[PDB]
Design a protein around this ligand. Structure first.
Ligand SMILES: [Zn+2]
Ligand SMILES: [Zn+2]
Ligand SMILES: [Zn+2]
Ligand SMILES: [Zn+2]
Lengths: 168, 9, 161
């Protein structure tokens, strides 16, 4: 079960995507520190948001190596977005700001996840297949085909090329 | 060219 | 699969031109070998199927290839013929080796852009894609871990559906 990348490999690959979000002025400002409900005067925050997340926390996790694989990072990003979309009204500046950051993230993440050997960067979700060789998890919709049976379990294209090139 | 004896280089 | 003659010459002529560009290495390969003019009647005895760059060019230009492996095969025929007839130590053998190195660096990307696995000559162990009828090396595309109950389908045809 699973792939563990080197912590440094993940931060080199993924930090540019985090930095793209920090670059968004003013849309990123409400996302740079954890929400302090006392300081901002919204005690109902922890009633609505059970798993808080923000850019600084994501950064600490890359830096201390707390992700083993990049879908965990993607999940934390979307947790932060879903949290702001949940708490704040559709009409509010923060909701609109959140939408802006999600648009930016989606353009950045696809190529980066691809260079890490994954199908794409869209949010993992429930419909995944784990590669039986390397442990990477891919979207069923990205990699599976009507025309193919896998007698020994799914194997990603990257693992297949590795076998194929070392036949020659 | 035509580098095949009969000729040179 | 039969390609349009113009599609093949646009794709493949740059690879032929790379060989013509090699001076002096290509000069012995530009015309068919005339054994009378060169004084080597034993050419006929050693080389059963002659080939050279001018002949390959005429074939692209008159559209005599239906698919690009035919072109690759003619190129290698020309190289194998020169390697067979000429001694390893001769300038022509070394010239031939030079052209084959050049061809191998050029051909992979070009054949890939034509929807093929690679451009190398490997077995006669090929698989035809059941959708578009391109032929690929078994060694390039087939795997223990993948079963095609209804026949092989190349990646290009898979992306299309
Ligand atoms: Zn995907
Ligand atoms: Zn894999
Ligand atoms: Zn091949
Ligand atoms: Zn095909």
């Amino acid at each position: 079960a699973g792939k563990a990348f080197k912590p440094e490999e993940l931060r080199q690959a993924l930090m540019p995507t985090l930095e793209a979000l920090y670059r968004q002025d003013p849309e990123s400002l409400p996302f740079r520190q954890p929400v302090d409900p006392q300081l901002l005067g919204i005690p109902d925050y922890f009633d609505i948001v059970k798993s808080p997340m923000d850019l600084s926390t994501i950064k600490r996790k890359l830096d201390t190596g707390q992700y083993q694989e990049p879908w965990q990072y993607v999940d934390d990003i979307w947790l932060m977005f879903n949290n702001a979309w949940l708490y704040n009204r559709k009409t509010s500046a923060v909701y609109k700001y959140c939408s802006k950051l999600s648009e930016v993230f989606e353009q950045e993440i696809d190529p980066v996840m691809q260079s890490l050997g994954y199908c794409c960067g869209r949010k993992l979700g429930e419909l995944f297949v784990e590669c039986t060789e390397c442990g990477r998890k891919m979207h069923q919709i990205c990699v599976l085909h009507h025309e193919i049976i896998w007698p020994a379990g799914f194997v990603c294209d990257g693992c297949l090329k590795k076998s194929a090139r070392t036949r020659k | 060219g035509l580098g095949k004896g009969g000729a040179k280089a």
